[PDB]
Amino acid sequence: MWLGALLDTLPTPALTIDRTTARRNAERMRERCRALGVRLRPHVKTHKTLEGGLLATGGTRRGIAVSTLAEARFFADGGFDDILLAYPVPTARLEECAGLARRLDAFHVLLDRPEALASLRQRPLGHGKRWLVWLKLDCGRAGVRPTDPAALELAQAIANDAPEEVTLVGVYAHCGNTYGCSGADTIQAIARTTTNAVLSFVAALRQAGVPCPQASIGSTPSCSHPIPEMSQLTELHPGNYIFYDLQQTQLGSCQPQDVAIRVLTRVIGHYAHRGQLLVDCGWAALSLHGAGGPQGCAAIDGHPELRLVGLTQEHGLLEHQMDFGRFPVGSVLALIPYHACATAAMHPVYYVHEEGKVVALWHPVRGW
Amino acid sequence: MWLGALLDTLPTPALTIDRTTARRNAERMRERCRALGVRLRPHVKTHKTLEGGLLATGGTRRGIAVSTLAEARFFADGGFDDILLAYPVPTARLEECAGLARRLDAFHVLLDRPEALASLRQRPLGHGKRWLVWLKLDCGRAGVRPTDPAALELAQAIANDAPEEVTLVGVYAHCGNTYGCSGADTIQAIARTTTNAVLSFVAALRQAGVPCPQASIGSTPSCSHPIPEMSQLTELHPGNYIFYDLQQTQLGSCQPQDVAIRVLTRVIGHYAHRGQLLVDCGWAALSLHGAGGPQGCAAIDGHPELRLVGLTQEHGLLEHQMDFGRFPVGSVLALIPYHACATAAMHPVYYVHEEGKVVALWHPVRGW
Structure with a gap:
């Protein structure tokens, strides 16, 4: 808890x-x-x-x-x-x-x-x-x-x-x-x-x-x-x-300040030989909404420099030529998902916060 | 139950x-x-x-x-x-x-x-x-x-x-x-x-x-x-x-007979003016895997005639010129999903069956 x-x-x-x-x-x-x-x-x-x-x-x-x-x-x-x-x-x-x-x-x-x-x-x-x-x-x-x-x-x-x-x-x-x-x-x-x-x-x-x-x-x-x-x-x-999202922002319904939802992710490893950040957020946490490529599933909040270039179930790959000193393993980036409804459907719990501190846990129903 | x-x-x-x-x-x-x-x-x-x-x-x-x-x-x-x-x-x-x-x-x-x-x-x-x-x-x-x-x-x-x-x-x-x-x-x-x-x-x-x-x-x-x-x-x-899936079948890892997974869906309405079946399966039940279009998210089992032309959260649209007498409202089609892992992640329960009869219910864990 x-x-x-x-x-x-x-x-x-x-x-x-x-x-x-x-x-x-x-x-x-x-x-x-x-x-x-x-x-x-x-x-x-x-x-x-x-x-x-x-x-x-x-x-x-x-x-x-x-x-x-x-x-x-x-x-x-x-x-x-x-x-x-x-x-x-x-x-x-x-x-x-x-x-x-x-x-x-x-x-x-x-x-x-x-x-x-x-x-x-x-x-x-x-x-x-x-x-x-x-x-x-x-x-x-x-x-x-x-x-x-x-x-x-x-x-x-x-x-x-x-x-x-x-x-x-x-x-x-x-x-x-x-x-x-x-x-x-x-x-x-x-x-x-x-x-x-x-x-x-x-x-x-x-x-x-x-x-x-x-x-x-x-x-x-x-x-x-x-x-x-x-x-x-x-x-x-x-x-x-x-909630809003990237899509809505791209549509003009809202300014970035309006988007309440993020998916927090961790840099879990660097790969110099490919100039890529590895993050612990794949599609299980994000959904493939915004591909139909993967670059459009989400943006990194406060980092126009980076983009998503790959998603697997539990992994994501990030690109810049990079700068691995700026993103130590263990640092947290906040992803802005494309489609709020879709991301939300992948989470059994939402961490609700004020002033950087978790103030509540919401649990969604799912199924039919 | x-x-x-x-x-x-x-x-x-x-x-x-x-x-x-x-x-x-x-x-x-x-x-x-x-x-x-x-x-x-x-x-x-x-x-x-x-x-x-x-x-x-x-x-x-x-x-x-x-x-x-x-x-x-x-x-x-x-x-x-x-x-x-x-x-x-x-x-x-x-x-x-x-x-x-x-x-x-x-x-x-x-x-x-x-x-x-x-x-x-x-x-x-x-x-x-x-x-x-x-x-x-x-x-x-x-x-x-x-x-x-x-x-x-x-x-x-x-x-x-x-x-x-x-x-x-x-x-x-x-x-x-x-x-x-x-x-x-x-x-x-x-x-x-x-x-x-x-x-x-x-x-x-x-x-x-x-x-x-x-x-x-x-x-x-x-x-x-x-x-x-x-x-x-x-x-x-x-x-x-x-489980296998369409992707694996398209890859050649397996014959259709090998694919254990379906998502059952119902025809919930006809639209003659657009030649489309409406089904109660959208992406909440299927995922958008196999688009990156929507035609590739799944095939209709035993019906090469039909293809998926649209998915919303809880809706799917099907096309043939159609034949709405063959698909009365209430009939069940069995969709073959593209990526087993992804579809499965959208379901809080799997109906497990033998000889057309539900023999068991499996409940997956989810989250991190």
Whole structure:
């Protein structure tokens, strides 16, 4: 157990989180939402921890989005409620989903397929509880396209065809395309295509008589630079912004000072004959995100001089012509990982710190 | 709990292991070693489970190699002994290492740096126990090159400079370069460069008077097609062969029938407007190994027709012009992952089966 310990005292490789940075990230996104006049429903998948959920949620333990039934149950058991399973409701695990809707005052599910609604129907919840259903709009991975006449009919059906077993809480979209383009202006344009498509859809819905109280979008990039139009929605659901990473920095969503996550690693040997540092962080600790080369999986914090040139399971190789006196064996470098969500998924524990001292240990759930 | 359950009954995504295939893989490598006249010291990092260790080890719980101190302790607590930490002994965790050498009759460590030997010296074990040290030869990631005069002096020092605190058990090499070349003949040539360099080194050692009882090499590819020269060594230490994977199949180390591992996934929706299957297996369940594109992370077992065209954290997209009637929502496809070690590291549980029925659950250790 490590409360109090100095950072460069931990066993490496080690996922570290700056709690100052994390808190500041959480509170910032909360304020952006207050300013817009919308609810924040953070997504917990970047961290999958109760503590994380607490920060994002501002201390309330209400209003989150999860990516799996394992997260759903984990947070449910930790006392969270108003939990949205942001994922095409899994018709093969409805007993579990129904279990959760029965325990919780508000467990939400998403669908984008009529047969999904059918499945829900033949598994009524009872107890005067209704499937709280959101319609996923693909404005292009999953969901119905808002211009497809079929989207309209499905929304219709969810909302009205069986008002005592199923209800339409709102429409749900994730502008995850912001992940394939560079700089604020493109990010914002995707934010705009997405906001207006959703607003058009809700407009059509009102015109046709389909009640639809809520309207949800957001990714870390588009909620890092919200556009005025977003205030006409009811809620934003980013998640990763609580940690950020190199990718987000390269995207422009955030300045380096915003990135709360590192993976600490040790120089465990020099190789002059190849001009390389050897570090005790391989891909088991980092993931191969940012290669598709290895140079892009992470940067060395405060050392633009060095880059990653190789990763094995438990080893990494670093290059400069080098300077092995500057990096004695036993020294700790702090790696900035490319994709927070991915690195985090490799760690059974996060060392959370303030002022260089470990202040807490968060343990993520995992699995399905 | 799932003992007995039919495969297509599990919650997906799910790592599955054919125990018939696994056993057969273990016993085969055991026989190759018997035939060669050498000891098998399997590496456990592809699976990191006690059950796995049991198979590889033939039921004995003795003679393994681990990639971390977490594995070392996990196996030590499960009753394994004669455990080699195949990794530049971590001078920053010597209290732990010393802890393990004291509990175990044989805990082995590797080094390739004089200062490492120095570190070992100022942390004597006591109790008439000696650091059991192997010399890592880089015949090109870590270790001393056998032609570097310095290799000779270091071996010398390990063996003789302090015979009551430190001993040289043998020389250790991993021909992990077989991972960058294609087909039996290149694999075998690397096997040969490596075997002879080691044999030359041991020859030099004998000539100079440096006792060196053991001599260890091996990777899954080179021990899948052992070369006669290998019989002059004392031990082989592959690991992955117990599961195999697409990579190994693409390399030629094994036929598809040899690959014990799958990740089961469900078709959770169709998208005609894009000719794509949606599956509940993203990278959280698979890893991004085999991209550096996504088509190469895995193949669909019995369906050369389909390929992976996208992975998100919890989603995968499949393509053919398609045929959505052949793949009803709820059907299970069995993905063949590229790199067993990497996929396995994403699963807190392996569903182990015979004749389509879950016969066991293995739980891997993880962390550092």
